[PDB]
Write a structure and sequence with these properties.
Blueprint: H1 9-28, H2 37-55, H3 60-69, H4 71-74, H5 81-87, H6 94-97
Helix pairs in contact: 1-2
Length: 120
Protein backbone atom coordinates (compact mmCIF):
# COMPACT_ATOMS: atom_id res chain seq x y z
CA UNK A 1 0.00 0.00 0.00
CA UNK A 2 1.30 3.41 -1.05
CA UNK A 3 -0.11 6.93 -1.25
CA UNK A 4 2.35 8.34 -3.76
CA UNK A 5 5.51 7.73 -5.78
CA UNK A 6 8.12 8.31 -3.07
CA UNK A 7 11.03 6.04 -2.22
CA UNK A 8 14.81 5.78 -2.01
CA UNK A 9 16.53 4.10 -4.96
CA UNK A 10 18.88 2.46 -2.46
CA UNK A 11 15.98 0.77 -0.67
CA UNK A 12 14.69 -0.93 -3.81
CA UNK A 13 18.14 -2.39 -4.43
CA UNK A 14 18.62 -3.31 -0.77
CA UNK A 15 15.37 -5.27 -0.54
CA UNK A 16 16.19 -7.09 -3.78
CA UNK A 17 19.21 -8.57 -2.00
CA UNK A 18 17.30 -10.13 0.90
CA UNK A 19 14.32 -11.14 -1.25
CA UNK A 20 16.67 -13.12 -3.49
CA UNK A 21 18.80 -14.69 -0.76
CA UNK A 22 15.49 -15.77 0.76
CA UNK A 23 14.59 -17.94 -2.23
CA UNK A 24 18.07 -19.39 -2.79
CA UNK A 25 17.96 -20.00 0.97
CA UNK A 26 14.63 -21.80 1.34
CA UNK A 27 15.49 -23.74 -1.82
CA UNK A 28 19.11 -24.76 -1.22
CA UNK A 29 18.28 -25.64 2.39
CA UNK A 30 15.75 -28.13 1.02
CA UNK A 31 18.07 -29.26 -1.77
CA UNK A 32 20.53 -30.75 0.71
CA UNK A 33 22.93 -28.19 -0.76
CA UNK A 34 26.11 -28.16 1.32
CA UNK A 35 26.81 -24.60 0.15
CA UNK A 36 27.92 -21.80 2.51
CA UNK A 37 25.28 -19.27 3.55
CA UNK A 38 27.55 -16.74 1.84
CA UNK A 39 27.19 -18.52 -1.50
CA UNK A 40 23.54 -17.54 -1.95
CA UNK A 41 24.15 -14.08 -0.49
CA UNK A 42 27.09 -13.18 -2.74
CA UNK A 43 25.11 -14.25 -5.81
CA UNK A 44 22.15 -12.12 -4.75
CA UNK A 45 24.08 -8.98 -3.80
CA UNK A 46 25.71 -9.36 -7.21
CA UNK A 47 22.45 -9.62 -9.16
CA UNK A 48 21.84 -5.97 -8.28
CA UNK A 49 25.43 -4.94 -9.00
CA UNK A 50 24.82 -6.26 -12.52
CA UNK A 51 21.19 -5.23 -12.93
CA UNK A 52 21.33 -1.67 -11.58
CA UNK A 53 24.35 -1.36 -13.87
CA UNK A 54 23.15 -2.83 -17.16
CA UNK A 55 20.03 -0.71 -16.65
CA UNK A 56 21.71 2.20 -14.87
CA UNK A 57 18.27 3.12 -13.54
CA UNK A 58 15.59 1.96 -11.10
CA UNK A 59 12.53 2.31 -13.33
CA UNK A 60 9.67 -0.09 -14.07
CA UNK A 61 11.85 -1.97 -16.55
CA UNK A 62 14.58 -2.53 -13.96
CA UNK A 63 11.98 -4.23 -11.76
CA UNK A 64 10.44 -6.09 -14.70
CA UNK A 65 13.75 -7.87 -15.28
CA UNK A 66 14.33 -8.50 -11.57
CA UNK A 67 10.89 -10.01 -10.95
CA UNK A 68 11.53 -12.01 -14.12
CA UNK A 69 14.78 -13.46 -12.77
CA UNK A 70 13.59 -14.55 -9.32
CA UNK A 71 10.26 -15.59 -10.83
CA UNK A 72 11.90 -18.52 -12.62
CA UNK A 73 13.53 -19.45 -9.32
CA UNK A 74 10.42 -19.74 -7.15
CA UNK A 75 8.47 -21.50 -9.90
CA UNK A 76 7.92 -25.21 -9.15
CA UNK A 77 8.84 -26.25 -12.69
CA UNK A 78 12.30 -24.67 -12.48
CA UNK A 79 14.24 -26.73 -9.94
CA UNK A 80 17.70 -26.40 -11.48
CA UNK A 81 18.15 -22.67 -12.10
CA UNK A 82 18.69 -21.89 -8.42
CA UNK A 83 21.22 -24.73 -8.53
CA UNK A 84 22.87 -23.50 -11.73
CA UNK A 85 23.80 -20.06 -10.39
CA UNK A 86 24.68 -21.44 -6.96
CA UNK A 87 26.78 -24.35 -8.23
CA UNK A 88 28.40 -22.05 -10.77
CA UNK A 89 26.84 -23.23 -14.02
CA UNK A 90 25.32 -19.77 -14.50
CA UNK A 91 26.68 -16.38 -13.47
CA UNK A 92 24.83 -13.60 -11.60
CA UNK A 93 25.74 -11.28 -14.48
CA UNK A 94 24.74 -13.37 -17.50
CA UNK A 95 21.59 -14.61 -15.75
CA UNK A 96 20.19 -11.20 -16.69
CA UNK A 97 21.06 -11.54 -20.38
CA UNK A 98 19.34 -14.93 -20.36
CA UNK A 99 16.14 -14.76 -22.41
CA UNK A 100 12.75 -15.52 -20.80
CA UNK A 101 12.47 -18.55 -23.08
CA UNK A 102 15.86 -19.97 -22.08
CA UNK A 103 15.42 -19.80 -18.30
CA UNK A 104 13.03 -22.71 -18.86
CA UNK A 105 15.21 -24.48 -21.43
CA UNK A 106 16.74 -26.31 -18.46
CA UNK A 107 19.29 -27.74 -20.90
CA UNK A 108 22.52 -29.39 -19.78
CA UNK A 109 24.68 -30.37 -22.76
CA UNK A 110 24.02 -26.79 -23.87
CA UNK A 111 26.38 -25.45 -21.22
CA UNK A 112 29.35 -27.41 -22.56
CA UNK A 113 30.03 -30.89 -23.94
CA UNK A 114 33.25 -31.36 -21.97
CA UNK A 115 31.98 -33.31 -18.96
CA UNK A 116 29.27 -35.96 -19.09
CA UNK A 117 28.90 -37.48 -15.61
CA UNK A 118 25.39 -38.54 -16.63
CA UNK A 119 24.05 -37.20 -13.33
CA UNK A 120 20.29 -37.62 -13.27
Amino acid sequence: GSSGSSGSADQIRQSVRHSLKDILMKRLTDSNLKVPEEKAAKVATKIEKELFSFFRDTDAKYKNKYRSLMFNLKDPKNNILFKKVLKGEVTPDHLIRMSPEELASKELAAWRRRSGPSSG
